[PDB]
Write a protein that binds this ligand. Structure first.
Ligand code: COO
Ligand code: PC7
Ligand code: PC7
Ligand code: PC7
Ligand code: PTY
Ligand code: PTY
Ligand code: PTY
Ligand code: PTY
Ligand code: 8Q1
Ligand code: FE
Ligand code: ZN
Lengths: 233, 210, 265, 123, 29, 249, 87
């Protein structure tokens, strides 16, 4: 709370002072390595006490940005370049859900347009490449086509489908078993049973692919590449 | 034939540099502007007081100047670029004026946005296009090359079309949205001290290798 | 050097210890809530399923780009900031002199719903605009894909064809040579003038030139970065009148001068 | 898109102090000074606002009477600025302050003479 | 192990002398 | 005015302060310590009235910052010379107090001007929207202007107070008249700057680069002095009475 | 008051006289719109001659990449009537 923020702020004063002292010590020894421009990107970023809670069995690509109060369930995957920002409100991702590369899942930055809605993503959900989810609810076993945009107040009911590149306007409800697409998004047709099977199997395949990529990324950083970068001329 | 190089860097311990100079073209960031750590600014980019650039955005001023004005915001995964020239014959720098809200996932190339405008999420503004002051573009709008959004109007669609004229209360709300986003960016700005402590990690990683 | 040097070094060690202790105390006071910044774990090039990307010598790959798995990139091509090329379940092939612009996603599929699943094939001298999505489709040589365009599985963009900015190209759609398609869903708009064909070619070569300066800057070491920072600061302003009084002429160092092929003229 | 920048573009010609004629471009509703600054015919740094209170005739242009009839008459303040900024303290009858001339569709094809730049950058 | 910049070391000594001499100046006045 | 505007701004700042100190030292020790008498005090009387009137009017005419400050300084030397004219220990003391306070205010004003010269400030209108782009700088500059206008309880109120104190007592009702008129004119052209920074809504804004540490510290100290001097004015009052007495003893 | 452009009527009369008294132009086809080549029986050498005559009478040089458009008396008068260097 307020006391917590006061101590967090005072803490920054002490830390700023200690780091300055360390730089002074390095300068007396003739070292300038603290001047190196190194990336300050954090895969998980806190905003005061609002911090991401990530299940141990969830893959998060290192280049992804998870900011604030974000929940990721078991078997879920956050792919390369994804951005998830829950600060004004929360974002929750269920188990077995894939958020594909370069997707954006965020909440309203300000309450000017009304109360900021949270973003709720259920279980075994597929969110396509470069999709935008803004303060919406996405129920279990639904499909969000890649490049689609879902605005705040939208509800995608279970087994709903949002076609690739669709623009679902504010407060639109997508009924179960229906395919909606276009700008604005409109009813296109009903979902077939084969499509439901593909929804489930594609989700299970993504969880296995996630496993493979998490093992790949978890390997120790190669020291030969480090030495090559250090010894460049 | 695809002949690779054995010396190409596969993993760079420094990560992507945020500030990419290009000859003498050095990106200029105001001391009271928030730029997210993974943003890339390259070349002729100026980010003014009170403005903010959010995670995953790319601002590449290698063909012309890019300017983000006072208390304006370029939100997540936006790409801002520019060309040598515009089809309209006007100069082709990308000008984002003051109190402008550029919605997330928006693509801007050699466009002008006059003061106090809102660009909806996932919008595209093409070469030589112009958004006049106190106008709003709906999410998913596509503005083709050299097209104009007249002042005081709400537009939208692919391609964008007139929807309705804005009320004075609505147009009064636009700088308020810009100010609120700046207020939010202050919280992120307060999380970063002037220096990082990564260099210590680099030091011990070096020492463990001798 | 000498005894004074050693003593000052030891005092610096003491000051460093004190500073790091103060930093730890300040971290404790913050309730340990601050997640610490760490060494970058992003890999520009990565193997998966024992597939290594094949990237030609003179290819600009931005450090923030992600090239993963079975990906081939030809001579003179460029992969820009934030691009993701994920060749994990299938093959991605990029021809020569082709630019993949910032924040673009290229992906493939293991098995499509129906038909023959095909790799992602991007030809020679192709421009792919910012934040495009290329998924399991084929772009032939000298084609243009607009910024923010989406190509779904089985799409074929033919030689000298254009996909407009913002378009959504539905699965298995064919864009014939000489036409421009756009919209959501994408559909025929008009024929491509000869001047626009020349534009497409010009786009490709301009990118080839831009890639050189970006690759040169992104590959510089710490020492060269510092040297150029100092040089840039020194030559940012001038007093030519005092130089004329001194009878000297300050010249811009060559490491701050861009090549003429990227200058507006 | 039913509303283009081409709808507001005003075709213009400017004669530089060396006498050479140039075809320049400006928007309707903006000032002649802005159109002149687009290509550097007048240094934008020398006249950054379009206000008469921030003007020392750095925007001054000479226009023939055929186009002068199509403009509003010079105000008292404009003539004051022009006269005092003259080296000889003489008011030129074809002189206009470029910052006070708003471009319109009726000014298509107007010819404008840009005199030699006066010193502007006070130590 | 050793700081090698001789001029930097001399400047460090000068700053230390200034600080200590200022303390002594206050103390003995 | 011409020299002040045309010189490099640091030169203008230096010329605005130090030579006045030195030459008033000289004037005190020559005239005050010497003896022709009423003729010379009348000289400074007539020149003071002329300087106040012309400074006020010409400053009201100015559209540029430097010229405005030059004419302001001319008017203030008129106010100061009123003290030399009345030929009393309190007159000398008030002249010294006026020089000290004018010097610290001029230092404040030129620190702001030098800070703004990094973006080439030239016209008063160039200050538009400054209360938005740098609120604490717009407030600081406003305090300087109100002090220049002599609004109490800012430090600048001391010179206005002695101007009227010397007129009412010596019997000079025309001088008091002139002081009232010129003070009101001065207040108008000083608050015009505040209006430009706080009330105007221009279409084009100028964004100014933040000042360096030296000018920020100097500005911070001079701004506390200007706001808080009349809470603890005893040292200046005593030191200046001391100086006035030391001219003859 | 001092001006910067010659009057339109004065320039019209001056150019009309110059063309009328040139060498091979009967002062009866010389109208304020008459074309040099189609309507005055003047070849390209003679039209260049006339344009060079326009330079002497108004005391300034017309750019080579601009003289190619002065083909009649109306285009001429349009050019010189707005050129500040004209005297
Ligand atoms: C130096 C660097 C070089 C590079 O690499 S450039 C890469 C970045 N830039 C880009 O990707 C943008 C490429 N240019 C384009 O996409 C562009 O639009 C485009 C080139 C198709 C079309 O631009 P045009 O100026 O040629 O537009 P048209 O004259 O053909 O207008 C036809 C029509 O299509 C509509 N319009 C046109 N543009 C588009 C679109 N896109 N979509 C949908 N609808 C449109 C428009 O409303 C028009 O009116 P209506 O049909 O009556 O409604
Ligand atoms: C284990 C318990 C002991 C803990 C001790 C903590 C005491 C620390 C107190 C803080 C002192 C702050 C002093 C501020 C001045 C900063 C001095 C400095 O920066 O050192 C510089 C310069 O030093 C000097 O020129 C003179 C000042 C040095 C004297 C004070 C040093 C403080 C520690 C004392 C170390 C010497 C003690 C032993 C001497 C034999 C080193 O040289 P450069 O890298 O070339 O300088 C670059 C420019 N810049 C200033 C921006 C960094
Ligand atoms: C009564 C006097 C006579 C009349 C004259 C009045 C003159 C003023 C006119 C009044 C009308 C309204 C004025 C509004 C001003 C209030 C707003 C303001 O000044 O806030 C400043 C605050 O300005 C200041 O900094 C004022 C500091 C003065 C310090 C004086 C106090 C001295 C002792 C205090 C000790 C320290 C604090 C103790 C508690 C922590 C914020 O400045 P910004 O430009 O918005 O941002 C600053 C940047 N940043 C916040 C990131 C640091
Ligand atoms: C900006 C405007 C707002 C108001 C101004 C605020 C600040 C202005 C600064 C005014 C300071 C005036 C300094 C007067 C000089 C006094 C020196 C003096 O009398 O000697 C001091 C010496 O004082 C010092 O050593 C310190 C000097 C002041 C240091 C202040 C640091 C500020 C640096 C300014 C630049 C940055 C006593 O030392 P001793 O040698 O022990 O005594 C000699 C006397 N006797 C022969 C009888 C033995
Ligand atoms: C400018 C901004 C003002 C500065 C802020 C205030 C300054 C306060 C610092 C002094 C504190 C301690 C002083 C120590 C002290 O008493 O020692 C004396 C030093 O005096 C001193 O340090 C004298 C300081 C004098 C300040 C400037 C006075 C200006 C007068 C205004 C007139 C301007 C008009 C000029 C035409 C010498 O000892 P001592 O007492 O034996 O020496 C005089 C015997 N007679
Ligand atoms: C409107 C009605 C008032 C118009 C002006 C009245 C002029 C007569 C005033 C008069 O008698 O002046 C005496 C001298 O004051 C003076 O100082 C003389 C008059 C002022 C001369 C300096 C100002 C000239 C104008 C400056 C601006 C214009 C520049 C040129 C264009 C005052 O008697 P006293 O005050 O000595 O009595 C001291 C008693 N104890
Ligand atoms: C009376 C009313 C109330 C007043 C309040 C009194 C309170 C006392 C003041 C307390 C000061 C608080 C801050 C102290 C810590 C700051 C230490 C300064 C750090 C420093 O070394 O500054 C350097 C610059 O010098 C500087 O910036 C110092 C010069 C500053 C100008 C002031 C002194 C000038 C000489 C005397 C003027 C007298 C005028 C009066 C007529 C380097 O700075 P950097 O490392 O950031 O690099 C700048 C880029 N070059
Ligand atoms: C030439 C001479 C020029 C010198 C300039 C004089 C300073 C300019 C004043 C501007 C800032 C000062 C703030 C005003 C003080 C507010 C409270 C006044 C007060 O009673 O405080 C006393 C003085 O504090 C102080 O000493 C005030 C802080 C100094 C800054 C402490 O009371 P005391 O009992 O210790 O002093 C015996 C007299 N009350
Ligand atoms: C004081 C003087 C100093 C300088 C003296 C210089 C003396 C130079 C003497 C030599 C000059 C020449 O003959 S230079 C050579 C000139 N010869 C030609 O041009 C032959 C081709 N003929 C034509 O082009 C046309 O018959 C023509 C009528 C010319 C124009 O075409 P039009 O029919 O479409 O008007
Ligand atoms: Fe002007
Ligand atoms: Zn995919």
């Amino acid at each position: 709370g307020t006391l917590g923020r006061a101590f967090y702020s005072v803490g920054f004063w002490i830390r700023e002072t200690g780091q300055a002292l360390d730089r002074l010590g390095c300068r007396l020894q003739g070292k300038n390595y603290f001047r190196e421009q190194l990336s300050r990107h954090r895969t998980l970023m806190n905003v005061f006490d609002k911090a991401p809670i990530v299940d141990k069995e969830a893959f998060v690509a290192p280049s992804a940005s998870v900011i604030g109060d974000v929940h990721i369930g078991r078997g879920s995957s956050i792919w390369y370049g994804c951005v998830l920002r829950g600060d004004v409100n929360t974002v929750s991702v269920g188990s077995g859900t894939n958020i594909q590369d370069n997707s954006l899942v965020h909440v309203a930055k300000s309450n000017l347009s009304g109360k900021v809605h949270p973003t709720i993503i259920g279980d075994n959900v597929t969110i396509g490449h470069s999709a935008v989810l803004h303060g919406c609810t996405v129920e279990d076993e639904t499909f969000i086509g890649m490049g689609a945009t879902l605005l705040d107040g939208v509800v995608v009911e279970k087994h709903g489908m949002v076609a690739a590149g669709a623009l679902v306007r504010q407060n639109t409800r997508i009924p179960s078993g229906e395919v909606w697409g276009g700008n604005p998004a409109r009813f296109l047709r009903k979902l077939t049973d084969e499509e439901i099977a593909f929804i489930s199997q594609s989700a299970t395949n993504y969880s296995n692919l996630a496993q493979a990529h998490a093992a790949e990324n978890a390997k120790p950083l190669n020291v030969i590449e480090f030495e090559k970068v250090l010894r460049k001329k | 034939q695809v002949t690779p190089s054995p010396d190409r860097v596969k993993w760079d311990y420094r990560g992507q540099r945020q500030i990419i100079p290009l000859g003498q073209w050095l990106p200029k960031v105001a001391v009271d502007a928030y730029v997210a750590p993974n943003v890339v600014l390259a070349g002729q980019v100026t980010v003014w007081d009170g403005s903010s650039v959010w995670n995953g955005a790319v601002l590449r001023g290698d063909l012309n100047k890019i300017t983000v004005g006072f208390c304006s915001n370029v939100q997540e995964r936006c790409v801002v670029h520019a060309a040598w020239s515009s089809p309209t014959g006007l100069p082709a720098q990308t000008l984002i004026d003051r109190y402008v809200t550029v919605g997330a996932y928006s693509l801007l190339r050699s466009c002008t946005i006059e003061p106090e405008c809102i660009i909806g999420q996932h919008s595209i503004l093409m070469e030589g296009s112009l958004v006049e002051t106190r106008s709003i573009l709906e999410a998913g709008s596509v503005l083709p090359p050299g097209r104009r959004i007249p002042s005081g109007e709400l537009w939208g669609g692919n391609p964008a079309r007139f929807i309705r004229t804005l009320t004075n209360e609505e147009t009064l709300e636009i700088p308020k949205l810009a100010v609120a986003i700046n207020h939010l960016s202050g919280d992120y700005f307060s999380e970063f001290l002037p220096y990082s402590t990564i260099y210590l990690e680099v030091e011990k990683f070096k020492k463990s290798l001798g | 050097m000498g005894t004074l040097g050693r003593a000052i070094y030891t005092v610096g060690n003491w000051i460093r210890g004190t500073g790091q202790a103060l930093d730890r105390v300040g971290s404790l006071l913050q309730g340990s809530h601050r997640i610490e910044e760490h060494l970058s774990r992003h890999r520009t090039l990565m193997n998966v399923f024992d597939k290594s990307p094949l990237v030609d010598k003179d290819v600009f790959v931005a450090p923030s780009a992600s090239v993963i798995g079975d990906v081939q990139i030809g001579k003179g091509s460029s992969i820009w900031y934030g691009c993701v090329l994920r060749g994990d379940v299938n093959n991605i092939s990029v021809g020569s002199g082709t630019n993949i612009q910032d924040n673009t996603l290229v992906h493939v599929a293991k098995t499509n719903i129906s038909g023959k699943v095909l790799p992602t094939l991007i030809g020679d001298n192709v421009t792919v605009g910012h934040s495009a999505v290329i998924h399991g489709c084929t772009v032939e040589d000298d084609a243009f894909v607009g910024m923010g365009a989406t190509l779904l599985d089985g799409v074929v963009v033919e030689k000298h064809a254009m996909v407009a900015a913002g378009s959504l190209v539905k699965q298995n759609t064919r864009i014939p040579s000489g036409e421009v398609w756009g919209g959501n869903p994408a559909k025929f708009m008009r024929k491509l003038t000869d001047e626009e064909i020349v534009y497409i070619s010009q786009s490709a070569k301009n990118y080839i030139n831009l890639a050189q300066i970006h690759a040169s800057e992104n590959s510089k070491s710490f020492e060269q970065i510092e040297v150029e920072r100092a040089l840039r600061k020194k030559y940012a302003r001038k007093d030519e009148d005092y130089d004329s009084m001194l009878g000297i002429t300050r010249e811009t160092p060559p490491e701050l001068i861009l090549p003429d092929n990227v200058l507006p003229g | 898109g039913s509303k283009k920048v081409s709808d507001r573009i005003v075709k213009l010609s400017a004669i530089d102090p060396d006498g050479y004629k140039q075809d320049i471009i400006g928007l309707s509703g903006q000032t002649l000074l802005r159109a002149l600054t687009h290509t550097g015919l007048i240094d934008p740094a020398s006249h950054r606002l379009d206000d008469i209170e921030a003007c020392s005739a750095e925007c001054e242009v000479q226009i023939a009477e055929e186009w002068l009839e199509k403009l509003p008459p010079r105000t008292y303040d404009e003539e004051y600025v022009l006269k005092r900024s003259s080296r000889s303290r003489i008011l030129n009858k074809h002189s206009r302050l470029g910052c006070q001339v708003v471009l319109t569709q009726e000014l298509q094809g107007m010819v404008v003479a840009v005199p030699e730049a006066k010193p502007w950058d006070i130590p | 192990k050793v700081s090698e910049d001789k001029n930097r070391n001399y400047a460090v000594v000068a700053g230390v002398v200034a600080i200590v001499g200022s303390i002594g100046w206050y103390l003995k006045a | 005015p011409d020299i002040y505007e045309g010189s490099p701004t640091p030169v203008t700042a230096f010329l605005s302060i130090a030579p006045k100190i030195s030459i008033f030292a000289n004037i005190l020790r020559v005239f005050i310590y010497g003896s022709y008498g009423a003729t010379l005090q009348q000289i400074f009387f007539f020149c003071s009235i002329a300087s106040m009137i012309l400074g006020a009017l010409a400053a009201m005419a100015q559209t540029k910052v430097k010229r405005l400050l030059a004419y302001s300084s001319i008017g203030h030397v008129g106010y100061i010379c009123i003290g030399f004219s009345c030929g009393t220990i309190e007159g000398i003391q008030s002249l010294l107090i006026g020089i000290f306070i004018y010097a610290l205010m001029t230092m404040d004003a030129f620190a702001i001007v030098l800070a703004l010269r990094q973006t080439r400030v030239k016209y008063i209108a160039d200050l538009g929207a400054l209360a938005k782009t740098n609120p604490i700088l717009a407030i600081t500059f406003s305090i300087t202007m109100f002090s220049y206008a002599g609004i109490p309880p800012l430090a600048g109120f001391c010179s206005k107070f002695y101007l009227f104190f010397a007129a009412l007592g010596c019997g000079a009702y025309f001088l008091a008249l002139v002081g009232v008129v010129t003070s009101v004119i001065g207040c108008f052209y000083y608050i015009r700057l505040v209006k430009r920074m706080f009330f105007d809504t221009p279409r084009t804004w100028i964004l100014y680069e933040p000042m360096d540490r030296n000018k920020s510290l100097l500005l911070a100290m001079t701004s506390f002095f200007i706001t808080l001097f009349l809470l603890y004015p005893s040292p200046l009052f005593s030191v200046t009475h001391q100086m006035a007495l030391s001219l003859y003893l | 008051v001092r001006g910067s452009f010659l009057d339109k009527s004065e320039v019209t009369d001056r150019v009309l006289s110059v063309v009328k008294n040139f060498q091979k132009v009967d002062p009866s086809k010389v109208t304020p719109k008459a074309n040099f080549q189609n309507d005055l029986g003047l070849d390209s050498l003679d039209s260049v001659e006339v344009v060079m005559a326009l330079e002497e009478e108004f005391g300034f040089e017309i750019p080579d990449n601009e003289a190619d458009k002065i083909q009649s008396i109306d285009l001429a008068v349009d050019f010189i009537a707005s050129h500040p260097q004209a005297k």
